[PDB]
């Protein structure tokens, strides 16, 4: 199937250059531009250039030069954006998309998006705990577990519940940043009949530390 | 060397309304061919990739259902929700393809709805937790509206003031409410020297705070 596959979170360290990838499928490689777009996190999307694997032309958006450079190895149907001795303002989401070759002038379908975060620091892992109710209840109707993610770095982290089989009832908040290090949060509710009668687990990933983490919710 | 501007920056209306949005380009998208304006419009969910919904300022792509409308023409257009529905939460991008590309600042959508109070829920730290000299008391705030909630922490009934963090979710897309979550954060020393731990939630459904609370030996 038409499909764009782009390489996971990564931490760079300051003046290095980052090379990312953009795995194309299910489409005539040679036959649609791939165009690269930056997001920071909460904030706009903006161009950064184009490139048309046939031919290998590359057009830029002014604010990039010097700094991105497009390339398309056809032989990997593989198109990959090099940003140059990076910084901090460098860090940021970075998508592909096929730029229909067509005539409708219109990214159609979309990688899933590489963040990166420039930064030196070390990349940490972070500790999953469970959160059970205290021994006293109301509204027993429903119940509220919950999973803490503290002290990892960089972002994102990713979060499900029974392996995404727990879909309803689930808030995960985002993350805010404690001396260097992120912490976030989510919740599940259930039926109060359910739990712990049937199994609930938080299932945590941080792909910059390749971290997973299944917390069963126990309670107590 | 072309640039875009949308407005408004922000909106909000309630389930069933009718919307509308505006894209202007410093110069003319439009070549020849017709119509063509080389005008999209993108939809941008948290947490998600951009989709396309509708290309040539007016041509809706496919799988794009019909009360999202694409108008206009030269450096003047328009996107329209009519019964916008609580999934359609998102930021909406317009893109130039006139000549390379310059996306719009784009134009968040809020919905509005019906007050309702938040569900809280308190949660004393967890025993591995407390084993690496951290503690951490977290209070859920869910399923509210409006946005405005203010929470109080309390150690033994003294309001708490400092270690405490606080973050909103995105609106939810299935009934268009919000949660919170505030968490105190302790060294396990300092946990240790008091008994009853307490968030108070005041938000504008109730001029009485909720309150939830446990404590230590509990």
């Known amino acids: 199937q038409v499909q764009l596959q782009q390489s996971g979170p990564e931490l760079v360290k300051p003046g290095t250059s980052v090379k990312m990838p953009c795995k194309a499928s299910g489409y005539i490689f040679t036959d649609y531009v791939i165009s690269w777009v930056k997001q920071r996190t909460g904030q706009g999307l903006e161009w950064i250039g184009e490139i048309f694997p046939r031919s290998g032309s590359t057009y830029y958006n002014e604010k990039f030069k010097g700094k991105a450079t497009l390339t398309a190895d056809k032989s990997s149907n593989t198109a990959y954006m090099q940003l140059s001795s990076v910084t901090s303002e460098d860090s940021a989401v970075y998508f592909c998309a096929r730029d229909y070759y067509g005539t409708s002038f219109a990214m159609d379908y979309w990688g899933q998006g590489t963040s990166v975060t420039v930064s030196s620091a070390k990349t940490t892992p972070p500790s999953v705990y469970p959160l059970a109710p205290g021994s006293a209840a109301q509204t027993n109707s429903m119940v509220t577990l919950g999973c803490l993610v503290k002290g990892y770095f960089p972002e994102p982290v990713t979060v499900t519940w029974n392996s995404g089989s727990l879909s309803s009832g689930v808030h995960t908040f985002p993350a805010v940043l404690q001396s260097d290090l992120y912490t976030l949060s989510s919740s599940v509710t259930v039926p109060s009949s359910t739990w712990p009668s049937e199994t609930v687990t938080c299932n945590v990933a941080h792909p910059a530390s390749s971290t997973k983490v299944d917390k069963k919710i126990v309670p107590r | 060397d072309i640039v875009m501007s949308q407005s408004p920056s922000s909106l909000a209306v309630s389930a069933g309304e009718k919307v509308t949005m505006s894209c202007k380009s410093s110069?003319?998208?439009?070549?020849?061919?017709?119509?063509?304006?080389?005008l999209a419009w993108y939809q941008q969910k948290p947490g998600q990739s951009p989709k396309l919904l509708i290309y040539?300022?007016?041509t809706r792509e496919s799988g794009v259902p019909d009360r999202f409308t694409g108008s206009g023409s030269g450096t003047d257009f328009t996107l329209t929700i009519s019964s916008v529905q609580a999934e359609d939460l998102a930021v909406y991008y317009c893109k130039q393809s006139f000549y390379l590309r310059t996306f719009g600042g784009g134009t968040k959508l809020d919905i509005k709805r019906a007050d309702a109070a938040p569900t809280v829920s308190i949660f004393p730290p967890s025993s591995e937790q407390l084993t690496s000299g951290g503690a951490s008391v977290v209070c859920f705030l869910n399923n509210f509206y409006p946005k405005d909630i203010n929470v109080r922490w309390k150690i033994d009934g003294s309001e708490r003031q400092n270690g405490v963090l606080n973050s909103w979710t995105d609106q939810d897309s299935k009934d268009s409410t919000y949660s919170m979550s505030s968490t105190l954060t302790l060294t396990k020393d300092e946990y240790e020297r008091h008994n009853s731990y307490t968030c108070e939630a005041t938000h504008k459904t109730s001029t009485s705070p909720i309150v939830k609370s446990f404590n230590r030996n509990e």
């Open positions: 110069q003319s998208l439009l070549n020849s061919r017709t119509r063509k304006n080389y």
């Open positions: 040539w300022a007016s």
